[PDB]
Design a protein around this motif. Structure first.
Motif, PDB file in Angstrom:
ATOM      1  N   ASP A 257      10.847   4.957   8.198  1.00 55.29           N
ATOM      2  CA  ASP A 257      11.277   4.460   6.904  1.00 55.29           C
ATOM      3  C   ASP A 257      10.118   4.468   5.917  1.00 55.29           C
ATOM      4  OD1 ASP A 257      11.962   2.713   4.605  1.00 55.29           O
ATOM      5  OD2 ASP A 257      13.582   1.943   5.907  1.00 55.29           O
TER       6      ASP A 257
ATOM      7  N   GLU B 223       9.495   2.888   3.246  1.00 57.24           N
ATOM      8  CA  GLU B 223       9.099   1.582   2.753  1.00 57.24           C
ATOM      9  C   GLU B 223       7.975   1.002   3.620  1.00 57.24           C
ATOM     10  OE1 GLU B 223      12.525  -0.920   2.168  1.00 57.24           O
ATOM     11  OE2 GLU B 223      11.308  -2.668   1.628  1.00 57.24           O
ATOM     12  N   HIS B 224       7.914   1.354   4.908  1.00 57.52           N
ATOM     13  CA  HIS B 224       6.938   0.717   5.775  1.00 57.52           C
ATOM     14  C   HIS B 224       5.852   1.697   6.209  1.00 57.52           C
ATOM     15  CE1 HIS B 224       9.858  -2.568   5.879  1.00 57.52           C
ATOM     16  NE2 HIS B 224      10.766  -1.732   6.355  1.00 57.52           N
ATOM     17  N   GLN B 225       5.699   2.813   5.481  1.00 62.39           N
ATOM     18  CA  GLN B 225       4.712   3.834   5.814  1.00 62.39           C
ATOM     19  C   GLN B 225       3.286   3.282   5.865  1.00 62.39           C
ATOM     20  OE1 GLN B 225       4.988   8.029   4.198  1.00 62.39           O
ATOM     21  NE2 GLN B 225       2.850   7.638   3.650  1.00 62.39           N
TER      22      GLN B 225
ATOM     23  N   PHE C 116       3.287  -7.299  12.274  1.00 59.83           N
ATOM     24  CA  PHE C 116       4.555  -6.816  11.746  1.00 59.83           C
ATOM     25  C   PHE C 116       5.590  -6.935  12.863  1.00 59.83           C
ATOM     26  CE2 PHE C 116       6.819  -4.117   8.653  1.00 59.83           C
ATOM     27  CZ  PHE C 116       7.860  -3.675   9.440  1.00 59.83           C
ATOM     28  N   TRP C 117       5.234  -6.442  14.046  1.00 63.51           N
ATOM     29  CA  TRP C 117       6.192  -6.379  15.125  1.00 63.51           C
ATOM     30  C   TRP C 117       6.515  -7.754  15.696  1.00 63.51           C
ATOM     31  CZ3 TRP C 117       9.453  -3.133  14.538  1.00 63.51           C
ATOM     32  CH2 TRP C 117       9.151  -1.854  14.056  1.00 63.51           C
TER      33      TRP C 117
ATOM     34  N   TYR D 255      -0.481  -4.488  12.110  1.00 63.02           N
ATOM     35  CA  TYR D 255       0.594  -3.758  12.756  1.00 63.02           C
ATOM     36  C   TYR D 255       1.205  -4.582  13.889  1.00 63.02           C
ATOM     37  CZ  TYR D 255       2.810   0.179  15.425  1.00 63.02           C
ATOM     38  OH  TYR D 255       3.632   1.014  16.123  1.00 63.02           O
TER      39      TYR D 255
ATOM     40  N   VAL E 205       1.968   0.296   6.533  1.00 62.36           N
ATOM     41  CA  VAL E 205       1.591  -0.574   7.635  1.00 62.36           C
ATOM     42  C   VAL E 205       1.950   0.068   8.981  1.00 62.36           C
ATOM     43  CG1 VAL E 205       3.680  -2.037   7.535  1.00 62.36           C
ATOM     44  CG2 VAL E 205       1.611  -2.946   8.599  1.00 62.36           C
ATOM     45  N   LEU E 206       2.897   1.023   9.050  1.00 54.26           N
ATOM     46  CA  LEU E 206       3.408   1.467  10.342  1.00 54.26           C
ATOM     47  C   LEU E 206       2.851   2.815  10.781  1.00 54.26           C
ATOM     48  CD1 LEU E 206       7.138   0.409  10.480  1.00 54.26           C
ATOM     49  CD2 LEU E 206       5.143  -0.921  11.036  1.00 54.26           C
TER      50      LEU E 206
ATOM     51  N   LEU F  29      12.433   2.333  11.971  1.00 57.37           N
ATOM     52  CA  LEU F  29      11.584   1.709  10.978  1.00 57.37           C
ATOM     53  C   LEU F  29      10.291   2.503  10.766  1.00 57.37           C
ATOM     54  CD1 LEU F  29      12.219  -1.994  11.985  1.00 57.37           C
ATOM     55  CD2 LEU F  29      12.806  -0.932   9.813  1.00 57.37           C
ATOM     56  N   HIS F  30       9.699   3.063  11.813  1.00 59.51           N
ATOM     57  CA  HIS F  30       8.475   3.820  11.588  1.00 59.51           C
ATOM     58  C   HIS F  30       8.701   4.987  10.623  1.00 59.51           C
ATOM     59  CE1 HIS F  30       6.972   1.636  15.108  1.00 59.51           C
ATOM     60  NE2 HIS F  30       5.776   2.038  14.759  1.00 59.51           N
TER      61      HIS F  30
ATOM     62  N   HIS G  51       8.876  -9.141  13.139  1.00 59.30           N
ATOM     63  CA  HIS G  51      10.165  -8.471  13.181  1.00 59.30           C
ATOM     64  C   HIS G  51      10.974  -8.898  14.407  1.00 59.30           C
ATOM     65  CE1 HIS G  51      12.783  -5.180  14.553  1.00 59.30           C
ATOM     66  NE2 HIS G  51      13.124  -5.152  13.271  1.00 59.30           N
TER      67      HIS G  51
END
Lengths: 493, 493, 493, 493
Positions: free
Chosen positions: B49, B51-53, B88-89, B85, B55-56, B46-47, B92
């Motif tokens: 990816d 799409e999530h740049q 998010f986790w 951040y 926030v990650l 995911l990091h 998730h």
């Protein structure tokens, strides 16, 4: 900005004031009322004192210097300056023994002047008269801020022609109202009442009245509780009740006439469902700041007390103190979160987030009796019997008491003064009113609870359920109900 | 930034790993460990990816794009981005079922790299060797951030040559250590351990060791608890234990050699009194944010549950829900107050206020069992017996269950899945570990209490007593003790 | 009195039993069910053991020696002997891990046989058939006591032709019933069910059924929860789940036929409002005694634990232990007060006072989660990670664990066995069922509360208000309402 | 048996009595003290009233009819008759507003006369004098029972030649004592004090004194707290403070002489460790019965209040009432369990079980503030402002109040009298003393806790651990320590 002397003089106006059932000739001289009168008079004099100009005063739109009790905040920084102002006063009044000086009472108007038009737009008037309610609010605000009037709200109604206040005539000059308002604070010590309603089932049009009403209006009687002031006691014995007592009361309106210019809205029960709550938001904000200061005072007293008694090294005592500290910091955190997540109204008013305000109140309301109880537990017997000043001044036994009741590092007198400060606030009628006021001030705990779940943020289909739905793999109520119905239709049962 | 595949491959490194007493050949394939391994592998993917740049990931000083698990905050706004951040986790991972992905574990290094010099300056080394500990920290940081290593701390020691980890040789190449570290999380799923100490009475010089140690170092054995993972169960029956289990464990160091470059400090017990606590501050921050998310998940489940059962209109139920909402908003308010009153370290690190962090933790720690208990109370018997998927799939009785256990607006299966989500988290060994971890993670409640009163802000002569002293008319301890002594000297007793 | 072997054999009767969705061929041999089967078999063998004759057996009216699970008490002393009997069993089953051996289940019949006639007198039967329900009860009692049958009640109904169990045919031979009973305990391990109803709004005549029904009746399916038994685990690791699991379940009646002789009452919803509650009184009595024993077990474990850990001299720990002791003694006191203020029924049954029974239950129900939580708090991390037996048996690391985890005066293994006993009971699915059963067993707390205020003793005009009325100088409701009305009539308003 | 008149006359004896620092000429006529004096005088007259002979009086060994305040119980049935006697008084004094009539105070002697010999045997006297302490106790008992003297204990000492009371001369006639006793109740209203000590670290021989001392002995000064009596208030306004105030105080002994015949023991600090606690057992018994009556009064008031206000049908209110009922029944159950498990002393005294007495006290002490707080919550604002009698008697507004504040089925006046009864007891200085007395009366909660774990029943090797040990398969401490040591000796570490 008025002087203390001008404030006192304004109270000598032929008002009809009952305290414990006695009719008070003059509120500024009667022993029952005079200490509190003097305390508010000093309140006014401090605003005029140059030393406190930065925290107490501001320069208004019109260019005039006025008291912060008239300051409408328009930013987070403004809100923080108001917070500092409320703190000044809670501190000056010893943790907040008096909860309703002008600074605490006037905040109820802030939402009206921010958004006046609805007050007119929603009104229901008789006989085709048309009244400029919104204009009334604006000019009301201009007069009370310029002349520095003292105002106290009376919004609560008697439970139950009803005995509740209601309109009994409308005419070209104004309205006539008859009946009771059920409760209000500092009534004998203000110039004008802000009367209003909070909606209750069955409320009629004629029972919906919002208006400014001078305290010495013909036919208005202030029926206040007995005074617990003790102006002749020794201050060592009663350090707080010697200052004064902030009386509370009911008020009877015997065909009281109110001119149209003083009316802010009449006639619409549904107005009373949304708009007074926005006024009470500002009281709650002020109150919730006081909560935190009171908790500061409690933990402070507890630290001094357990230190004076030698018990602050007991791990149990440490542990309980830590929870008093946590009680303080909880209230403080809700106040910070409220300010920090506030937002501006349409009118440009910066308003703390009522979610953190009310939930912070709730935290205080739920636990305060436990924090007081714990402070008393720390005292031990010293609270049952603690000598008077006369006992310590006895020529023979008094020195014997000073000997018997002293501590390693604190005299008998000083240590007993800690007990007496705790007794005065939490174990007297005088002090009990404070606690009772805080309990039933605006929205009480049981109602904060029920109102919480009525809020949109906290509905079953609202966003507080998003995380849960995602974990369960669920749509919304509608999506789920759909699957269920289909499972019924695709079987036979 | 590593890939999931690179992360998995890095775990196949000959590490010696015991789970329930079984030696695990390969942590990425063994049923006991593989689900969690896969969940962290996805974490890494995911990091990467796009799409999530936002926030990650971030762009570091050196110009390279890295994961936010390596981001040191330098402003309030940075802290808020870290908060987002961590959220998010926690989201998730379904409210935070796994408490220690790299994002939660790596935060322990933030204080070291912010202020390395003391780690060297305070060190006590043998035989005149001189080691550049501070340099070691800087280059450690440069390697682990560039290569994206996964690290887990082991700081807790066995109670009690002691069995505690201690230095048994120093030489020109590095040190040799023998004994146990008592507890650590995700041990089988990281590349390196951050070993350290938190001061305890009697700790010797040789027991003071801070160092990075690869998980497959010769002589290092990871002794983990049994797995509660259920990779073969049906996800309907066990929705969470089917994903994996974040194992915890002890570790035995059998004459493990550590090169100097991997050592961050040795030898000084008093170092261990101040500096590890500043590391654990950052864990507490992360944890306390998780608290609030967990409380969000709880109130969410409760809303869905009582809605599904038809009980959310009972005033008692409403009232209890309101208190679950208040539990959530309390944790959230402490998190906001902590961020809002943070300050920068000397090194330029922006650090949330630990007073609100720890007192928010305390609020969670004290009440969480009550919030879980209340959620279970809402379920009723549905928790004692709730059908498996196999029961609902039975050709004859299964449709009968779907009929018997359905609600007005939710099917039997969906409603039972709410019970099962609650059972999995709060009524299984799998879930019990979560709650137990949260209870004994870093500073537990009884110690938050005792540490609170050790803080300077909360001493008897500190500022929390100012308001009380002013009300009583008291100087400080010294002033009061002076009056007492004089009253003794001016009498005869 | 039957033997264990006769009891086991009686379970091999073609019953249809689902556990976790698997159909169990033979309940006495299947790993999921066999440990519990064996534990009840031993239960039967102990009754036959001469050593325990005094406490376990008695000589009945008919002159035959029978098990105390069939003993109807007729005096306070009889009740005390029953109490000793329930204690024997709660002790033999380790604080009460199994809540429903025959001794706990059979008590539900005691009120029926004490007062059978109403069961017939209140009945509503179809088509002019006349059934001797009271005779049925007497002969039911004579058969089950003589043959020593094992019986378990199923009284709870599914919420909501309804899916609830209901009569779908009446004929000269008996009745036919279809639908579910919602919950029952030990179903796979008894010979016959006692089915019944507790009144709920909307209950029809056809839904009112009280009857004995053999477990292997054609068309009856027992749908039980998954087994948490662990017959193959090591007893050191799982000391309790290795014994067995007392399963709970639902039951589906697919046109099950019941002969008239087995029917105890049908047809009258209002019967179900008063008479089943008198049956559940006896369960509550038994349960409430178990409460006290469980609290004894908890404080015992806590004493051993804090002693083993070295913490029992901390004043905070002492203080918490004292509250665990008080939790035990509270439950014990309610049990004593209940027995001591009991009275005989019309039928001559000596019945403990249900006021103390239910309020004692309430005390347990309210606080148990706090007592468990406190016991866990005492463990610390030892509960997160505690080695398995295989870990201690490792040739190299195992002796290292015995070294690392030992205490001054207790070995590593013994001390970890305390943790594991606590984990098994309060932190496993196995143990969670116990707690969940106790929570939702008969009348739960919220209902004890509401039923309390419905009792006659506690009405506004009842005797609990006498002292208050006397202090206020008040008559009854009627007297006060009279004065009010007169004050209205003697004024104009 | 004395008359009220004889009791009053006995108080006019030149005693030196300070109340609030004022020296009281005559305790029977001074407004501060006279109401309470009159209430005890009535107490004496009721004993002489034939109507109450059965419950109030008995025929002693010597054949004389005496008051039950002198009745030593010798059976369970005697204890139950004493319980009924204490209840009569708690009821006659309105739930127990006065906690220390002779019936409550005299119980402290019961253990002395039951077992006098140790009082002599343990004594330490100076200069070879030999005093017949045991004889002294017997003849003390014969005089005070025959003449019906009123006695109050003073056992508590000032914290800290010490200021504590201590012997400063012994001579052939008796002893001389100087210093303070720290607290005692009803001092101005008794004939003689029972002075004693409860052991505290550092207590010397000369500080150990048990003796009867007449209240008007030369050199004895009673230093009492201010009176909260309001003899001139209107009873409608203040229904309880108009009756009187049971004052508490300290006492200074200025070289007071006590003749040997009045001395019960001197000189042995260790005597003070065991024997006074057996005296305080009887106070605790009496107190604990009062607890239950107070809780009865509270639930009664709450029932009337919520009924009068219309709120007793709210499920939340119902729920809280139920918990008030449970609070009452808990106290009652401990009282029943205590009596029921009592036993006879060696001397033949039947003594309730102190375990249930103290744990029942603890239950009261922990929760009482919550029960009071809940009662106040039910009142709402009616407690902040409730009209005086003068307000209701106003010719114009008074009828308006009766109209405004009435309920459906209760007049304004009656309903406000409920508020005022609650305010008087829980929100006045007058009432606050009651609560404070109950809090710090004999052993307070924190000490009940610590003493609980010192008892033999509750030691780690005591019987409360048997069930736990059996479940774990453990011997005693010694057995376990043995295995551990052997495991150490059979390894190398």
């Amino acid at each position: 900005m008025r002087t203390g002397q001008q404030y006192l003089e304004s109270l000598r106006d032929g008002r009809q004031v009952y305290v414990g059932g006695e009719l008070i000739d003059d509120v500024t001289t009667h022993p029952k009322t005079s200490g509190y009168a003097k305390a508010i008079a000093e309140y006014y004099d401090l605003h005029l004192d140059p030393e406190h100009q930065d925290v107490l005063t501001f320069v208004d739109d019109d260019g005039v210097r006025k008291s912060m009790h008239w300051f409408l905040p328009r930013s987070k920084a403004d809100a923080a300056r108001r917070r500092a102002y409320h703190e000044f006063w809670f501190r000056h009044f010893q943790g907040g023994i008096f909860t309703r000086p002008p600074a605490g009472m006037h905040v109820v108007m802030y939402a009206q002047i921010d958004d006046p038009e609805p007050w007119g737009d929603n009104a229901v008037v008789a006989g085709g008269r048309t009244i400029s309610f919104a204009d009334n609010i604006r000019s009301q605000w201009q007069r009370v801020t310029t002349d520095d009037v003292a105002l106290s709200p009376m919004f609560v109604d008697v439970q139950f022609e009803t005995p509740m206040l209601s309109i009994v005539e409308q005419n070209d000059q104004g309205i006539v109202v008859r009946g009771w308002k059920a409760m209000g604070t500092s009534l004998p010590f203000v110039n004008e009442l802000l009367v209003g309603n909070l909606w209750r089932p069955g409320q009629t049009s004629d029972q919906t009245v919002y208006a400014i009403v001078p305290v010495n209006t013909p036919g208005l009687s202030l029926v206040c509780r007995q005074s617990n002031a003790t102006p002749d006691a020794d201050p060592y014995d009663h350090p707080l009740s010697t200052i004064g007592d902030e009386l509370d009361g009911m008020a009877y309106f015997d065909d009281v006439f109110i001119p149209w210019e003083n009316v802010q809205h009449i006639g619409n029960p549904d107005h009373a469902k949304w708009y007074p709550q926005r006024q009470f938001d500002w009281v709650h904000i002020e109150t919730q700041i006081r909560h935190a200061v009171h908790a500061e005072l409690i933990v402070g007293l507890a630290l001094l007390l357990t230190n004076a008694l030698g018990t602050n090294n007991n791990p149990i005592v440490q542990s309980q103190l830590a929870d008093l500290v946590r009680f303080r910091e909880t209230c403080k955190a809700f106040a910070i979160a409220a300010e920090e997540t506030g937002f501006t109204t349409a009118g440009g008013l910066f308003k703390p987030n009522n979610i953190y305000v009310d939930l912070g109140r709730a935290h205080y309301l739920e636990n305060i009796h436990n924090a007081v109880n714990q402070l008393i537990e720390f005292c031990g017997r010293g609270v049952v019997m603690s000598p008077t000043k006369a006992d310590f001044d006895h020529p023979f036994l008094g020195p014997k008491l000073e000997e018997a009741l002293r501590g390693t590092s604190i005299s008998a007198r000083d240590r007993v003064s800690i007990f007496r400060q705790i007794s005065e606030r939490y174990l007297t009628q005088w002090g009990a009113r404070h606690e009772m006021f805080e309990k039933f001030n605006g929205t009480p705990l049981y109602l904060v609870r029920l109102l919480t779940m009525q809020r949109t943020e906290y509905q079953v289909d609202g966003p507080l359920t998003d995380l849960a739905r995602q974990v369960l793999g669920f749509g919304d109520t509608e999506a789920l109900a759909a699957r269920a119905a289909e499972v019924e239709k695709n079987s036979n049962w």
